[PDB]
Design an enzyme around this catalytic site. Structure first.
Site, PDB file in Angstrom:
ATOM      1  N   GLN A 126      11.194  53.505  28.585  1.00  0.00           N
ATOM      2  CA  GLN A 126      12.510  53.053  28.166  1.00  0.00           C
ATOM      3  C   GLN A 126      12.396  52.281  26.851  1.00  0.00           C
ATOM      4  O   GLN A 126      13.170  52.492  25.914  1.00  0.00           O
ATOM      5  CB  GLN A 126      13.181  52.175  29.236  1.00  0.00           C
ATOM      6  N   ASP A 142       8.847  51.685  15.127  1.00  0.00           N
ATOM      7  CA  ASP A 142       8.709  50.541  14.190  1.00  0.00           C
ATOM      8  C   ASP A 142       9.223  49.179  14.678  1.00  0.00           C
ATOM      9  O   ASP A 142       9.473  48.286  13.860  1.00  0.00           O
ATOM     10  CB  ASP A 142       9.431  50.885  12.899  1.00  0.00           C
ATOM     11  N   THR A 170      16.322  53.592  13.841  1.00  0.00           N
ATOM     12  CA  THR A 170      15.302  54.243  13.013  1.00  0.00           C
ATOM     13  C   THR A 170      14.410  55.198  13.839  1.00  0.00           C
ATOM     14  O   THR A 170      13.906  54.818  14.879  1.00  0.00           O
ATOM     15  CB  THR A 170      14.380  53.245  12.291  1.00  0.00           C
ATOM     16  N   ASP A 230      13.373  52.347  20.929  1.00  0.00           N
ATOM     17  CA  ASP A 230      12.905  52.195  19.562  1.00  0.00           C
ATOM     18  C   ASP A 230      13.319  53.416  18.718  1.00  0.00           C
ATOM     19  O   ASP A 230      13.523  53.299  17.527  1.00  0.00           O
ATOM     20  CB  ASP A 230      11.395  51.965  19.562  1.00  0.00           C
ATOM     21  N   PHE A 282      11.496  56.018  13.304  1.00  0.00           N
ATOM     22  CA  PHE A 282      10.111  55.596  13.289  1.00  0.00           C
ATOM     23  C   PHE A 282       9.881  54.647  14.444  1.00  0.00           C
ATOM     24  O   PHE A 282      10.800  53.918  14.847  1.00  0.00           O
ATOM     25  CB  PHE A 282       9.777  54.898  11.977  1.00  0.00           C
ATOM     26  N   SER A 332      12.097  48.609  15.931  1.00  0.00           N
ATOM     27  CA  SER A 332      13.471  48.406  15.554  1.00  0.00           C
ATOM     28  C   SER A 332      14.275  47.801  16.724  1.00  0.00           C
ATOM     29  O   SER A 332      15.287  47.135  16.512  1.00  0.00           O
ATOM     30  CB  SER A 332      14.080  49.714  15.064  1.00  0.00           C
ATOM     31  N   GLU A 369      20.700  46.081  29.759  1.00  0.00           N
ATOM     32  CA  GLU A 369      21.081  47.100  30.708  1.00  0.00           C
ATOM     33  C   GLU A 369      20.374  46.993  32.054  1.00  0.00           C
ATOM     34  O   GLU A 369      20.973  47.259  33.061  1.00  0.00           O
ATOM     35  CB  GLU A 369      20.902  48.489  30.153  1.00  0.00           C
ATOM     36  N   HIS A 426      14.131  58.830  33.837  1.00  0.00           N
ATOM     37  CA  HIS A 426      15.144  58.595  34.854  1.00  0.00           C
ATOM     38  C   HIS A 426      14.614  58.970  36.260  1.00  0.00           C
ATOM     39  O   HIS A 426      14.980  58.359  37.208  1.00  0.00           O
ATOM     40  CB  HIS A 426      16.407  59.412  34.503  1.00  0.00           C
ATOM     41  N   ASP A 444      11.707  54.853  24.082  1.00  0.00           N
ATOM     42  CA  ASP A 444      12.944  55.566  23.882  1.00  0.00           C
ATOM     43  C   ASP A 444      13.904  54.739  22.976  1.00  0.00           C
ATOM     44  O   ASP A 444      14.502  55.257  22.027  1.00  0.00           O
ATOM     45  CB  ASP A 444      13.626  55.799  25.218  1.00  0.00           C
TER      46      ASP A 444
END
Ligand code: HEM
Ligand SMILES: *[C@@H]1O[C@H](CO)[C@@H](O)[C@H](O)[C@H]1NC(C)=O
Ligand SMILES: *[C@@H]1O[C@H](CO)[C@@H](O)[C@H](O)[C@H]1NC(C)=O
Ligand SMILES: *[C@@H]1O[C@H](CO)[C@@H](O)[C@H](O)[C@H]1NC(C)=O
Ligand SMILES: *[C@@H]1O[C@H](CO)[C@@H](O)[C@H](O)[C@H]1NC(C)=O
Ligand SMILES: NC[C@H](O)c1ccc(O)cc1
Ligand SMILES: [Ca+2]
Length: 595
Positions: free
Chosen positions: A105, A188, A184, A110, A186, A190, A258, A351, A108
């Site tokens: 997760q 990275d 992004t 990122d 990448f 994010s 979440e 999932h 994913d």
């Protein structure tokens, strides 16, 4: 082209040749095509979209329009006849920790995010979908079939809104609808730092020139930090307990709260950023805040890359790993590092790995309190259990000691997700992630299962017995052909996840290929990959490799007993070692003296 409301980006930004750090948006990674992999651009189309109208409309939209000559089944019917199961006994993965699910997760998040348009919609349109189940514009409700318990207690449908797309721009040429990736491409971090300037700035601690990420001021975790809370009403984390009034966390990615283990993981990542900034300052008290923020970010970005590609990918892909992701050869600038649309469904194999409960464990890895084990659905958008009820240390211990759900052809998705999912903007623990996954598959114009089989150099079953041999399962194949009536029409999410797992892996052949290519592309196509000659020093790179999730946990919690290999099923105290028996990240090679 109807006058439908849509969002389209301009969206251009300029580039710096000399820059030693990544941009927030991911622009300028590739010199020749600077928007490649940047956020808020179209997801890449590995194969042409397949819409009912060779247009935005999705299969299942018009009654009398068939797909290859057959009506496509309702997403909720497929979910009930194939995806669902009652008995939670025997479903756990004897050789995967629950941390294995959780990293996926994280990775994913990122990489991709295709938010619905509805957030940008009129209140009359939001309520028309929920209140009346009327299909229009974006609104694309998941209708219940006739023999469905949810009919009796919930209404005639589940609300669903179509994903955001890059809106028609000239010349209204015939291009099919193209959904946006809002983060992004990448790998990275994010999800920790943001994919847009405005968020990335809000997250930062400007006030102290130490390069810190802002932390919570209203609550602490035995002195250790929490992410700031996020100011916006309504807050779903508020809605789930209006007595506790604990809002959602504010993080580099919208979806952080979440579920409670995701928030836990985001909380671990924040702490490591701060720990790194402090130790870098010590070494280099002359470095200013920007330099300390950027150098920490960069270290954390490499950390996610190493954990993913050295520890996570080999045990997802198993025996196919080497074939799709062979050892590193350096930055190839003609590789497309953009995330594909199909990847955003491939990677939903996670999932099937989510189990029905979450546990809190004490310092002897024993149940933390009387209701230490809890049902997954009580933990959607639940920050109060962290803030009020023990902090992250117990939760982290259960990520180590508990197990992921094993995928299984007659026990696909737990009912905690398949019947009791909570979503922001709807009031009930009453949704079905499987149904949503299928509806979204269609929303995105995904080619069907055989197109992707054929894409990946695999056979394409046309009959029941064809299908049986590929799925190695007569009853599942039967149910699928009864629903679809063919294999060409099987939605890629359900088709890819139905195939038995490859050796030493946790996905089948089709998914291993799809995932395989994507990850190879995002590594090879990344100018800032940790190992790419020139990004880190020689000596930096020998310290960086040493990283481990275990070390991350020791460094950023008060846990002192962790296993060496965290994604493995590990049982305590047998597989657990003192933190001291584990390598550190040696930061000496970051000392940059005058000479
Ligand atoms: C309790 C745990 C989790 C829950 C409740 C959950 C639920 C969701 C929901 C509701 C969506 C959005 C569906 C949509 O609007 O189309 C989503 C997106 C997604 N999830 Fe999860 N998820 C969980 C963990 C995971 C894991 C473990 C993986 C894989 C390792 C995963 C992979 C994805 C992917 C690939 C997407 C699509 C992201 C995109 O929009 O591009 N999720 N998840
Ligand atoms: C557990 O998984 C790892 C791969 O993650 C493997 O090396 C090891 O042999 C596995 N153990 C068993 C008993 O299958
Ligand atoms: C910013 O850092 C200072 C210490 O340098 C601290 O006192 C303050 O709490 C931080 N602010 C936030 C919002 O994290
Ligand atoms: C709400 O939170 C309070 C503590 O802040 C707790 O005692 C109560 O049981 C929670 N209620 C629900 C319905 O989760
Ligand atoms: C760079 O990527 C392209 C993708 O088509 C490939 O043709 C080429 O082999 C790659 N070059 C190197 C040196 O790996
Ligand atoms: N952020 C709320 C929304 O329900 C959501 C939550 C979690 C996801 O992984 C994807 C989408
Ligand atoms: Ca990213």
């Amino acid at each position: 082209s109807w006058e439908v409301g849509c969002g389209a980006p301009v969206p251009l930004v300029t580039c710096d040749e000399q820059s030693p750090y990544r941009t927030i948006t991911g622009d300028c990674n590739n010199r020749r095509s600077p928007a490649l992999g940047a956020a808020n651009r179209a997801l890449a189309r590995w194969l042409p979209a397949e819409y009912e109208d060779g247009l935005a409309v999705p299969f299942g939209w018009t009654q009398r329009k068939t797909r290859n000559g057959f009506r496509v089944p309702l997403a909720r019917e497929v979910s009930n006849k194939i995806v669902g199961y009652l008995d939670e006994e025997g479903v756990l993965d004897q050789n995967r920790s629950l941390l294995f699910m959780q990293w996926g997760q994280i990775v994913d998040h990122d990489l991709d995010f295709a938010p619905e348009t509805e957030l940008g919609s009129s209140e009359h349109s939001k309520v028309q979908c929920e209140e009346y189940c009327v299909q229009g514009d974006e609104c694309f409700p998941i209708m219940f079939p006739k023999n469905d318990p949810k009919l009796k207690t919930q209404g005639k449908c589940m609300p669903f809104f179509r994903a955001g797309f890059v809106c028609p721009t000239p010349p209204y040429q015939s291009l099919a609808r193209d959904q946006i990736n809002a983060v992004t491409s990448f790998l990275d971090a994010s999800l920790v730092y943001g994919s847009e300037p405005s968020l990335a700035s809000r997250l930062r601690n400007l006030s102290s020139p130490l390069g810190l990420m802002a932390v919570n001021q209203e609550a602490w975790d035995h002195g250790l930090a929490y992410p700031p809370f996020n100011n916006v009403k309504p807050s779903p984390c508020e809605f789930i307990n209006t007595t506790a009034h604990v809002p959602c966390f504010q993080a580099g990615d919208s979806r952080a709260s979440e579920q409670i283990l995701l928030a836990t993981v985001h909380t671990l990542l924040l702490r490591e950023h701060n720990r790194l900034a402090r130790e870098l300052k010590r070494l280099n008290p002359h470095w200013d805040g920007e330099m300390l923020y950027q150098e920490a970010r960069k270290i954390l970005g490499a950390f996610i890359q190493i954990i993913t590609f050295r520890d996570y990918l080999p045990i997802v892909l198993g025996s196919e790993m080497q074939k799709w992701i062979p050892p590193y050869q350096g930055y190839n600038n003609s590789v497309d590092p953009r995330i594909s649309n199909v990847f955003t469904f491939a990677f939903r194999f996670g999932h099937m790995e989510v189990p029905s409960t979450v546990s809190r464990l004490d310092e002897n890895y024993q149940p933390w309190g009387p209701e230490a084990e809890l049902p997954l659905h009580t933990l959607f958008f639940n920050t109060w259990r962290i803030i009020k009820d023990g902090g992250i240390d117990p939760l982290v211990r259960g990520l180590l000691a508990k197990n992921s759900k094993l995928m299984n052809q007659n026990k696909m998705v737990t009912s905690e997700l398949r019947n009791k999912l909570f979503q922001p903007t709807h009031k009930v623990h009453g949704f079905d992630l499987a149904a949503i996954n299928l509806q979204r598959c269609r929303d995105h114009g995904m080619p069907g299962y055989n197109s992707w089989r054929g894409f990946c150099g695999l056979s394409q079953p046309k009959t029941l017995k064809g299908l049986q041999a590929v799925l190695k399962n007569k009853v599942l194949a039967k149910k699928l052909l009864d629903l679809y009536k063919t294999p060409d029409n099987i939605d890629i999410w359900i088709g890819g996840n139905a195939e038995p797992m490859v050796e030493r892996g946790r996905v089948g052949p089709l998914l291993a290929c799809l995932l395989g290519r994507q990850f190879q592309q995002i590594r090879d196509g990344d100018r800032f990959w940790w190992e790419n000659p020139g990004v880190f020093t020689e000596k930096q790179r020998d310290s960086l490799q040493k990283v481990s999730f275990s070390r991350l946990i020791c460094d950023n919690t008060h846990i002192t007993k962790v296993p060496l290999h965290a994604f493995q099923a590990n049982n305590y105290p047998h597989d657990f070692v003192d933190c001291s028996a584990v390598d550190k990240l040696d930061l000496s090679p970051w000392a940059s003296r005058e000479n």
